[PDB]
């Protein structure tokens, strides 16, 4: 039993809610919140810009030190950093950005990172400003993640379409 509330159950391990992931994180304070990161951990917009803003830019400061030490992530890769005031940990995961020409096949590799964590609050990888089809992202999530994932979908219209079209 966990403190996630109001989710629709899609499968044994995947749950979905129309919610602002920032507000969800502030309420639940989950062990792991997933960020929709890029390889440079530049949290300018989308989910990443919103999460960083909620940390008063502390996420960006920590991320800049991480990159200065380790260099960029791989597309499909991840790193674990602090969750600041939002969660114990933030798992920064890089899905492919279609608006950069990146291979959508890397989306499965990106979701595999979730399997290293028993429970996660997460957005749909490569959705929004990363330019992939969110219906596809949900399918890859369900077919790849085996741990317990609570998906927050900001757009109510998109949430309804994802539910109604789910196989
Ligand atoms: O949810 C999407 C990503 N964007 C966010 N998700 C959750 N919380 C957020 N807070 C700020 C941005 C943001 C991905 C699926 C979609 F394409 F259907 C709607 C957008
Ligand atoms: Cl977005």
UniProtKB/Swiss-Prot annotation:
Q: Which organism was this protein described from?
A: Severe acute respiratory syndrome coronavirus 2 (2019-nCoV)
Please state what the protein is called: Papain-like protease nsp3
Q: Which domain of life is it from?
A: Viruses
**How is the activity of this chain controlled?**
Inhibited in vitro by GRL-0617.
Q: Where in the cell is it found?
A: Host endoplasmic reticulum membrane
Subunit info here reads: May form homohexamers. Interacts with N protein.
Protein task: Responsible for the cleavages located at the N-terminus of the replicase polyprotein. Participates together with nsp4 in the assembly of virally-induced cytoplasmic double-membrane vesicles necessary for viral replication. Antagonizes innate immune induction of type I interferon by blocking the phosphorylation, dimerization and subsequent nuclear translocation of host IRF3. Also prevents host NF-kappa-B signaling. In addition, PL-PRO possesses a deubiquitinating/deISGylating activity and processes both 'Lys-48'- and 'Lys-63'-linked polyubiquitin chains from cellular substrates.
Q: How does it sit in the membrane?
A: Multi-pass membrane protein
> Which catalytic reaction applies to this protein?
Thiol-dependent hydrolysis of ester, thioester, amide, peptide and isopeptide bonds formed by the C-terminal Gly of ubiquitin (a 76-residue protein attached to proteins as an intracellular targeting signal)
Q: Ranges for the Macro domain?
A: 1-167
